[PDB]
Each structure stands twice: as structure tokens, then as C-alpha cells.
């Protein structure tokens, strides 16, 4: 009964990080001059 429950414990798995943990990513956005017109070149 409980023998299987207490004998079926395997060592805690060591995760293999497939990619770096990301919160921030680049995004291309338009800009305007101080007067308020398009600059025709995005940043």
C-alpha cells in the first residue's frame, strides 16, 4: 500500500533552461518632433 507511495520518490528534477527568462523585448515605435509631425524614421 503505502510502500509504493514512499518508494516511488525520484530526486527532484533539475530544470534545463531552454531560453533566458525574458520580461523585456525590443519594439519599434514611431517618433515625433517637438512640433508634432512624423520623422519618417522609427526608433
Amino acid at each position: 500500500s503505502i510502500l509504493k507511495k514512499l518508494e516511488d520518490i525520484k530526486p527532484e528534477q533539475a530544470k534545463a533552461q531552454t531560453k533566458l527568462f525574458r520580461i523585456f523585448e525590443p519594439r519599434q515605435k514611431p517618433i515625433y518632433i517637438a512640433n508634432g509631425e512624423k520623422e519618417r524614421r522609427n526608433r
Binding site: 515625433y32 518632433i33 517637438a34 520623422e39
Partner: protein, 133 residues
């Protein structure tokens, strides 16, 4: 005290390095610091003079923000920058001349004029350009 020096150094940098033709990448830090200084100093009232024969003057800080878009600086950019700079430097010089004309027999390390007294608050400690002098 140190806040005043930071303002002075920033004002000198803005007065000097902002010239026609220079690459905008060379003053990106300077323009960001200048914009931060304008934001911090805007919307406050300061008074000067009142003792001896110093002309009492009143300053109100309502100003815009310099653009961060032009690839190469142009003439109107310089004229607006100098328009802000003249008022800022007049305020700095008047604050200094008001500070020089008041003394305290005890606790001389502390501000004496109203301007430096106001600038001692933690809110105005956002402008600490450098202390190279």
C-alpha cells in the same frame, strides 16, 4: 549647496555644448539631464532680496520641455535653449548674491537665504550632475 553647484554645472554645459551642427548623440545625456532639471524645477515659487538694498525679485517657473527628436540640432533649438538658459542663470546669480549677503553666528554650514533653505529639501535632490570642482 551641492544642488546649486549641480545646477550651475548643468547650466554651463547647456550654455556651452549646445551649438549648431553637433551630433545629437553627443548631448543625449546632457539633454536628458536638462529635461529632468526643468521638470524638477517647474511649478515652484521662489523669492529673493529684502535685506539691505538688494532688489526684491519674484520668479515663477512655467516652462516647456526641449525636444529629443532632431537628428542634428538647428537654430531654433539653440534659441529656445538660450531663452531658458538666460532665466535659469539669472535666478542662479541672484540666489548666490542673496546668499552672500546674510550670515549666522552659529551653524554656518547650513543654508541662510530662503532659496538655499528650500533647495535643502529631499525633493530637489534629483539634480546631482557631478562634483568635479
Amino acid at each position: 549647496m551641492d544642488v546649486l553647484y549641480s545646477l550651475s554645472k548643468t547650466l554651463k554645459d547647456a550654455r556651452d555644448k549646445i551649438v549648431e551642427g553637433t551630433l545629437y548623440s553627443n548631448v543625449s545625456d546632457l539633454i536628458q539631464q536638462f529635461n529632468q532639471m526643468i521638470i524638477t524645477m517647474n511649478g515652484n515659487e521662489f523669492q529673493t532680496g529684502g535685506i539691505g538694498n538688494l532688489p526684491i525679485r519674484n520668479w515663477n517657473f512655467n516652462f516647456g520641455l526641449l525636444g529629443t527628436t532632431l537628428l542634428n540640432l538647428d537654430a531654433n533649438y539653440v534659441e529656445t535653449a538660450r531663452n531658458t538658459i538666460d532665466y535659469f542663470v539669472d535666478f542662479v546669480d541672484n540666489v548666490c548674491m542673496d546668499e552672500m549677503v546674510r550670515e549666522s553666528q552659529r551653524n554656518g554650514i547650513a543654508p541662510q537665504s530662503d532659496s538655499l533653505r528650500k533647495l535643502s529639501a529631499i525633493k530637489f535632490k534629483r539634480i546631482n550632475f557631478d562634483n568635479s570642482s
